[PDB]
Amino acid sequence: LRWITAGESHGRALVAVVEGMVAGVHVTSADIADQLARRRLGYAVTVLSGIRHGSTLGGPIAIEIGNTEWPKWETVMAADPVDPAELADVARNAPLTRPRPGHADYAGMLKYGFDDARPVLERASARETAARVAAGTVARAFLRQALGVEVLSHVISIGASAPYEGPPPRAEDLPAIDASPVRAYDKAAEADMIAQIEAAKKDGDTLGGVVEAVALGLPVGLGSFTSGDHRLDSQLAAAVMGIQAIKGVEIGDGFQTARRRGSRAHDEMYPGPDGVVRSTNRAGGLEGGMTNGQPLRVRAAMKPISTVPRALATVDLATGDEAVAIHQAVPAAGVVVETMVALVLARAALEKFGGDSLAETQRNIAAYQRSVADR
Amino acid sequence: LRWITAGESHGRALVAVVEGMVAGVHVTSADIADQLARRRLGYAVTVLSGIRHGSTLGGPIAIEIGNTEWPKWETVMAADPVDPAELADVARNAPLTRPRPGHADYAGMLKYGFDDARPVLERASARETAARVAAGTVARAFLRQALGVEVLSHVISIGASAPYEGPPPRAEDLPAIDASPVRAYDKAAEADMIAQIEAAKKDGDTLGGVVEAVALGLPVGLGSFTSGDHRLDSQLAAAVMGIQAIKGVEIGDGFQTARRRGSRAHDEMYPGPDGVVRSTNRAGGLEGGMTNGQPLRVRAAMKPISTVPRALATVDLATGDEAVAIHQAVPAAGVVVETMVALVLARAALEKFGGDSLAETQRNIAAYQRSVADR
Amino acid sequence: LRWITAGESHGRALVAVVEGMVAGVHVTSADIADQLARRRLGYAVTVLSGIRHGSTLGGPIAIEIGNTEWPKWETVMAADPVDPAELADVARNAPLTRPRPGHADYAGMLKYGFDDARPVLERASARETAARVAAGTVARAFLRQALGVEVLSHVISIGASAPYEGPPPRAEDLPAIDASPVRAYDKAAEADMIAQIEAAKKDGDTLGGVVEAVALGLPVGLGSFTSGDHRLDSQLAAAVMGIQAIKGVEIGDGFQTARRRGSRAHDEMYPGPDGVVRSTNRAGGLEGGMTNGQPLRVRAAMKPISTVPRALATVDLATGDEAVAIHQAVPAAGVVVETMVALVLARAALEKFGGDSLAETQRNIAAYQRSVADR
Amino acid sequence: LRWITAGESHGRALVAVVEGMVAGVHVTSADIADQLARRRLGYAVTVLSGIRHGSTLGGPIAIEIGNTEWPKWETVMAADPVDPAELADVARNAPLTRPRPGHADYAGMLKYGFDDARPVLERASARETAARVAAGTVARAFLRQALGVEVLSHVISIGASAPYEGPPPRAEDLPAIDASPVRAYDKAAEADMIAQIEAAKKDGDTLGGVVEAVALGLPVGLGSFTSGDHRLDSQLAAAVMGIQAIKGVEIGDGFQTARRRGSRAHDEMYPGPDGVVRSTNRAGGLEGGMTNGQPLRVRAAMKPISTVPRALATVDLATGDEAVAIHQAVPAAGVVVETMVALVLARAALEKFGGDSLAETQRNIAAYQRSVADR
């Protein structure tokens, strides 16, 4: 499994391409739209290729997401050349030479030899995550139909709220979570987070937060211990840290595990009727690079990403003079993290179970499951 | 740049291979040995290929690290078949059927259809990190000679100690850090950590901790904002999360950034004589996926990895009965994290500056630096 | 540099994506259209992302090519589900169960568990090569602007014609070649090929042939001898053999080299004013995996790809009974081979010279060239 | 599946590493030695990791091949620095500044900024193919045990001999082939080739030739039609063209197919008791990028690789003056081609059938085979 996104924030459209998905997975334009809608939660889809009659074909799946604001940008972001005199009269084509702290602006301009930040922010912008969730929808359809696996998210903290550290939600809690204005699972934590936002809004300030993706129903043995790169945690870490504004990733109890003693840090195993059973999940469902059957828990730390008006000092690269950054989402981050987790899980599953069609993959899964049971 | 490790913990030797390194980098067997020694800090090298007269050749560099304990294992871990009757009399060839919680044992056995955990732990074991640091030594020689970049580490916390949150060390502080029994930079933090260890030792328990790699002297613009996978933070996250026992990774102030307001979360920029200058480094030297010139800071959370005697319940997979796990390092984790950081930085540098020889790469670096200055 | 194509032959559109191209390369929708036109030689483009005002941005370039016949196929090749009763009345949705010999039909159906060949031929079809040449246009713009490199093709033989073995064309011969109905460089060879086609047409039969891509102006040292995969010939071979209907690839004099004696097989070197000079090019501009500065010559053998009416016996997979294959281009193959060659050359150039913008890459090229001259 | 080779021709040893091979494949140091012996046909192995008691472990397999001539080279090819005064007295450390035509010498020196060709030829040398066949032995053990697939080779032509175009050999013909001084299958062709060699030897000249690898017993559907890179022919082409001295690759009847009419170019299908049956194999067992069940045939054109004494003019790069190249194998090429074919087939099989152990892979294979039969 591979995935690619393309598109500028104010270009004509975004494109998501996924290659390597088995034929026979049921996914539709509506499913993609539903997931794009979930991305819009918190306080135009065209399938071009790879799917026929709601079922994947096995070839590359290309998904286009149109930008509604395109008529406003079709000259400033035109693909082809445009008379530079006609363009000099266009206010919105003014160059951006004041990099926002915390953004790709400054490093991107220097890296690519740009003197206008526009090409950098157009591509760096988190609007790109919409293309990711289009791709992620294919992965999650596969995960559900092949493995009975569900993926979801909930917000652990926003701003200075007290982190919810109770049990993670199951799939049936998703409607309640999605109806929450902060996509919180816990009512007390919800109230605390809403309060933090209210105070930040009034102060005209911005907040980041912590988000936890949960994947349920995974078989034992996805990922591997054979090298650093094959470890599922390594894979998960790359996929979620690569999301815009993410500054930290944890598996399970993460950094808090590093503060516990070995006697209380791990998940002990006990005899059960249908295999080994654990009573805690501090590992977050990954041990030694592989899924252990427990719920997968991955946490992502998002920094405040909205630029706070007239608060951040910067430099005008055109002049060398002082300036202030001019401005241009935790629950939605949760949704994007779901997507990223889904993509990697799906890739890991195809790696272990192979197959070119869903039925074949399903056969291999069943047979692996039977063999584990016959142990 | 690519790197591969091979070797079982009790096999004849470990092998590290790095491919894609430019010719003309000065690295020697002694340098590799020095770095392997640093890995042994905390409370036989043969270069087979790719280096000639202390200078890289451009082809694959293969580095062998011999296992001193091999004569004890040369039958149990023999490559070739061995009479199963002769082997049944060998005590140390007894099968391991009681997976340690927190380790690859259980998931690995199920994944590969093993009924003895030996093949799993032999490869999963953190002894493998010795092969990594062999490979890492080539990367850091390159980083130093091509970019004047230095990489180091210090321990932030061990067990329940109070995290050192003062300034990171510079390269000249490395001797003092390496002489510390806990590789601490800060004396007060050092004392606190030693205390935590002393109490854990007496209790017969084990500790994890937090470690911070620091890379200094990086040019602006390594990594990219163009997609998730090209983000340097994504790359860093994969490389360090893939290290044994690591459950969390942060860039800069990490999870704490997610608890701050946007007005206080970022690093403001100011005019300077030789380019833009910042007064804080909350970003940890990465913004929007790229190096900004500030010190690179990456943090890794290590779980306690030593199995605590007769404390952890498990299952005997042979019988289905209850059992207890039988047993088989924070400052050293710091050293391994250095290695991983070095490897990715080196890869990112070769990606941007290209070249087949060090001189060529150095030319390209100089010219990129000149162009940035002429802005 | 990476490239991806997506699209079914009768889907709404094709998509080409190229990732890793430096910013600042001048390419336009018109240039892509021109190259798509050349593909149509022999006896609707929308740039969605990655290019602004005729200049590459550095991010992923997505190029859409619309299918004009889409209204006819928008139900049979609909992405979303369609009432199976409404579909059963549609003649053109009849299933294809008689695999054509020489095509992906049979193996594809078995591989993916299809009982209709439609999903296989839709993706396998050489219509996909249109997406390739869209991507190839970006590479060749880069090659021209960064390296002064030109890529072209001419046909060596069609059917049983006598292979033209005279000198390859230069770039100024391209108009004459493109005006030839068989894209021949040599007039005598041209007449012979036209004759072979005329006789085949009259016999109601089909022809394959041999095609030679030529790349001019390459620097010494693209590709490498360090391993099999880094050899440029290896790379070239993969890219052109992967083209539909190609059964053979040669570099330079290819299979004929294997029939010569060592004394007459190679290209001897002689002193020249601006470096070493050769008087023959039997190697086809590659030696030991790298460009030697001579014209690059790559040859591809295309099998007859059009199914000959009622001539080819096959099986009806639905019944197990005998059947005949029902039917569903050498100069155009030449054009596609150009594309493939361009893509790999561009990737190899970016590998050696690095850079994130064209100017930077150009600096590195100049400096490498100066260093070679100062030898 | 991935493979890496490392080693210089006169270094201490060669290393082959293969990663991604399933656990439970029976391969031994003896098997590797046997295959290294076959490579030595025509007119010290240590397994360091990844194999235990003659059975693969699932981790990276590292195989060391010692160089017997090492004591002669241990100063000239020393890894570590050596007094340059002590080295200046060593005759065999004299620099090589006269590139051989047809070799990596000239392009390699320029590419890496070397003024001595020694580092180039040490790595470029076909001695490296010994590391490949070590790796190839693991793949072929897997192919045999998982799929009942056998791989072999025979020589089609050497020098100006008349190409043997009769039927390819089966596995039982391998002893007779390996006993032939030119590894010919056909007695008449054998005599012709021996004659060509005799005449070349007497003339003090060198020969290249054509070689054909044959793989038998493949399932339908390895490789794919979904994109250029997934085509098995593309993969095969890269792997064999990347072999030293190979200038051409064909699948099946290759370039001759391009000279036939469509009515006679392909392999017609007929009804059979256990699936579809063909009476010709012009395709060489690949159609539309995938295996069709027929014998896989791949042909490689090897140029004469031995430098003919005082016959080839070149330049002394030290002076700019004329010079002559000073000197430093078709049946063995056949053996190496076998290896390369085996590696890719094995990778393609693991891609389709997945699995982490041989038993699991075998289950998936059986079930795929059953499903095809139940069609």
Coordinates of C-alpha atoms in Angstrom, one line a residue, chain B residues 2-8 11-15 17 19 21-23 27-30 46-62 64 75-82 87 93 111-114 116 118-119 123 356-357 360, chain D residues 2-8 11-15 17 19 21-23 27-30 46-62 64 75-82 87 93 111-114 116 118-119 123 356-357 360:
Chain B
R2 CA 20.2 3.5 3.6
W3 CA 21.1 1.4 6.6
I4 CA 20.6 -2.2 7.5
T5 CA 21.4 -4.2 10.6
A6 CA 21.8 -8.0 10.8
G7 CA 22.7 -10.3 13.7
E8 CA 21.2 -12.3 16.5
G11 CA 25.0 -15.2 16.9
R12 CA 28.6 -15.1 15.7
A13 CA 28.5 -11.4 14.9
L14 CA 26.4 -8.4 14.0
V15 CA 26.6 -6.7 10.6
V17 CA 25.6 -2.0 6.2
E19 CA 24.7 2.2 1.3
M21 CA 27.4 7.3 1.5
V22 CA 29.6 9.7 -0.5
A23 CA 33.2 8.8 -1.1
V27 CA 35.9 7.3 9.3
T28 CA 37.9 4.6 10.8
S29 CA 37.6 1.3 12.8
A30 CA 38.7 3.3 15.9
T46 CA 36.0 -5.2 11.6
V47 CA 35.3 -2.9 8.6
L48 CA 34.7 -5.4 5.7
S49 CA 34.1 -3.0 2.8
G50 CA 33.5 0.5 1.6
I51 CA 36.4 2.2 3.4
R52 CA 40.0 2.4 2.3
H53 CA 42.8 4.0 4.3
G54 CA 40.3 5.7 6.6
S55 CA 38.3 7.2 3.7
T56 CA 34.9 6.0 2.4
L57 CA 34.9 4.6 -1.1
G58 CA 31.3 5.3 -2.1
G59 CA 30.1 1.8 -2.2
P60 CA 28.3 -0.2 0.5
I61 CA 30.1 0.0 3.9
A62 CA 29.8 -3.3 5.8
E64 CA 31.1 -6.5 11.5
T75 CA 25.7 -25.1 18.8
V76 CA 22.5 -23.6 20.1
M77 CA 22.8 -20.8 17.5
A78 CA 24.5 -22.8 14.8
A79 CA 23.6 -21.8 11.3
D80 CA 23.6 -25.3 10.0
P81 CA 21.7 -28.4 11.1
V82 CA 22.7 -30.2 14.3
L87 CA 20.8 -30.9 21.0
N93 CA 18.8 -25.1 24.1
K111 CA 3.3 -14.0 14.0
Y112 CA 6.0 -16.4 12.9
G113 CA 4.5 -19.7 14.1
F114 CA 7.2 -20.3 16.6
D116 CA 10.0 -21.3 21.1
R118 CA 14.4 -17.9 21.2
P119 CA 14.4 -16.9 17.5
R123 CA 16.7 -10.7 16.9
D356 CA 29.0 11.5 -5.0
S357 CA 32.0 12.7 -3.0
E360 CA 31.2 17.8 -4.3
Chain D
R2 CA 15.3 -7.0 -0.3
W3 CA 18.9 -7.8 -1.1
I4 CA 22.2 -6.0 -0.7
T5 CA 25.8 -6.9 -1.6
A6 CA 28.9 -5.3 -0.2
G7 CA 32.6 -6.0 -0.7
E8 CA 35.5 -4.9 -2.8
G11 CA 38.8 -6.5 0.3
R12 CA 38.7 -8.9 3.2
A13 CA 35.4 -10.4 2.3
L14 CA 32.1 -10.0 0.5
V15 CA 28.8 -9.7 2.4
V17 CA 22.3 -9.5 3.1
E19 CA 15.9 -9.0 4.4
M21 CA 12.6 -13.7 3.9
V22 CA 10.0 -15.8 5.8
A23 CA 11.1 -18.0 8.7
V27 CA 18.9 -23.4 3.5
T28 CA 22.4 -24.1 4.6
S29 CA 26.0 -23.0 4.2
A30 CA 26.6 -26.1 2.0
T46 CA 30.1 -18.1 6.7
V47 CA 26.4 -17.5 7.6
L48 CA 26.5 -14.7 10.2
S49 CA 22.8 -14.3 10.9
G50 CA 19.2 -15.1 10.1
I51 CA 19.6 -18.9 9.9
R52 CA 19.4 -21.4 12.7
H53 CA 20.0 -25.1 12.4
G54 CA 19.5 -24.9 8.6
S55 CA 16.3 -23.0 8.9
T56 CA 15.7 -19.2 8.2
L57 CA 14.7 -17.2 11.3
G58 CA 12.8 -14.4 9.6
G59 CA 15.3 -11.6 10.3
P60 CA 18.0 -10.3 8.0
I61 CA 20.2 -13.1 6.6
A62 CA 23.9 -12.0 6.4
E64 CA 30.0 -13.6 4.4
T75 CA 47.8 -3.0 3.1
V76 CA 46.7 -1.7 -0.3
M77 CA 43.0 -2.3 0.6
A78 CA 43.4 -1.7 4.4
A79 CA 40.3 -0.1 5.9
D80 CA 42.3 2.1 8.2
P81 CA 44.9 4.8 7.4
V82 CA 48.4 3.7 6.5
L87 CA 52.6 2.9 0.9
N93 CA 49.5 0.4 -4.7
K111 CA 31.7 10.8 -11.0
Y112 CA 33.4 10.3 -7.7
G113 CA 36.4 12.7 -8.2
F114 CA 38.9 9.9 -8.1
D116 CA 43.0 6.5 -9.3
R118 CA 41.3 1.4 -8.0
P119 CA 38.3 2.3 -5.8
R123 CA 33.6 -2.4 -6.4
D356 CA 5.8 -14.6 7.9
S357 CA 6.7 -18.3 7.8
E360 CA 1.8 -19.7 6.3

